[PDB]
């Protein structure tokens, strides 16, 4: 009969995720704190969420569809924020996903220190 209700979660829906990802850290003994993107807190939860909605990490990366997300987060359509999205994940959502996946193999590729050699003559 009477159909017309509304009141989905807003602040909680976000806290939920953070809480979970936080428990993973609180265990080791580290404090979870989100950075400030363009003078605006970057809500990881949503961030990643939007990405999947637009297509996914793979697809998005292929078509570099990062501008859409970042921009949708209130950020300006540039480049800096573009790479930021990825990093934020590899900086915070690095381990969380490293375990969620299961495949121990999946790990952050470490670089190869650069060496230098000098030679003189008489």
Ends apart, CA distance between termini: 99 Å
The CATH class label is Mainly Alpha
What percentage of residues falls in helices of 4 or more residues? 40-55%
> Can you tell me the CATH architecture?
Orthogonal Bundle
The assembly state of the depicted protein chains is monomer
The total of beta strands comes to: 0
Question: What is the number of domains?
Answer: 1
Query: Helices and strands, in N-to-C order?
Result: HHHHHH
Shape: elongated
CATH topology: DNA polymerase, domain 1
SSE class:
mainly alpha
Question: If helices are DSSP runs of H or I spanning 4 or more residues, what is the number of helices?
Answer: 6
| Major sheet | none
Strand content: under 5%
Domain ARID: 11-101
Subcellular location: Nucleus
Protein name: Lysine-specific demethylase 5B
Cross-link (Glycyl lysine isopeptide (Lys-Gly) (interchain with G-Cter in SUMO2)): 62, 118
């Amino acid at each position: 009969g009477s159909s017309g209700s509304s009141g989905e979660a807003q602040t909680r829906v976000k806290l939920n995720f953070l809480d979970q990802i936080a428990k993973y850290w609180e265990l080791q003994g580290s404090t979870l704190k989100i950075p400030h993107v363009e003078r605006k807190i970057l809500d990881l939860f949503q961030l990643n969420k939007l990405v999947a909605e637009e297509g996914g990490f793979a697809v998005v990366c292929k078509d570099r569809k990062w501008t859409k997300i970042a921009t949708k987060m209130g950020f300006a359509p540039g480049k800096a924020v573009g790479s930021h999205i990825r990093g934020h994940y590899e900086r915070i959502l690095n381990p969380y996903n490293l375990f969620l996946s299961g495949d121990s193999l999946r790990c952050l590729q470490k670089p190869n220190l650069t060496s230098d050699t000098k030679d003189k003559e008489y």
